[PDB]
């Protein structure tokens, strides 16, 4: 699933046991645009079937940025079982983004 970040939906996703992707975007970022392109089909693939994606708007959700220790748009943070596994900034290789979600 893909949904806008909110406190309540994020906390419920983290308590669910499912993997969670925090995707920090900006409406005027060509990298972000580019990422979104390549991530959208990856989100629909069977290996991603349990992934809960939250889109954090860099411009409007500043409390979320502090929580996630995020200083740049195009940051991706992957959680499993409620704990951060890895993060990535600015990556636009389709194979690298696939592997970021999969490994």
Author numbering: 0 to 102
What did the original publication write about this model?
The gene of ETAE_2186 was among the top 3 upregulated genes and was annotated as a hypothetical thioredoxin; here, we named it Trx-like protein (Trxlp). In this study, we found that one of the most significant infection-induced E. piscicida genes, trxlp, could be secreted and translocated into the cytosol of host cells upon infection, showing a conserved crystal structure to the host thioredoxin protein. Taken together, our results provide the first comprehensive, functional analysis of the E. piscicida Trx family protein Trxlp, a novel virulence effector that mimics endogenous TRX1 to target ASK1 and suppress its activation, thereby inhibiting the phosphorylation of Erk1/2- and p38-MAPKs and disrupting the expression of inflammatory cytokines and diminishing the host antibacterial defense.
The structure was refined to an R-value of 17.7% (Rfree = 21.5%) with good geometry at a resolution of 1.98 Å. Trxlp contains a central β-sheet composed of 3 parallel (β1, β2, β3) and 2 antiparallel strands (β4, β5). This central β-sheet is sandwiched by 2 layers of helices: a bottom layer with 2 helices (α1, α3) and a top layer with the other 2 helices (α2, α4). The structure obtained here is in reduced form, as evidence by the 3.3 Å distance between 2 sulfur atoms of 2 cysteines in the CXXC motif. Trxlp can be superimposed to Trxs from other species, with root-main-square deviation (rmsd) values ranging from 1.54 to 1.74 Å for around 100 equivalent Cα pairs. Minor conformational differences among these structures were observed in flexible loop regions connecting α helices and β strands. Trxlp shares a conserved structure and critical WCXXC-motif site not only with bacterial Trxs, but also with mammalian Trxs. Notably, either mutation in Trxlp (W50F, C51/53S, FSXXS) or mutation in ASK1-TBD (C250S) significantly impaired the interactions between them. Taken together, unlike the classical Trxs, Trxlp might not exhibit robust redox activity.
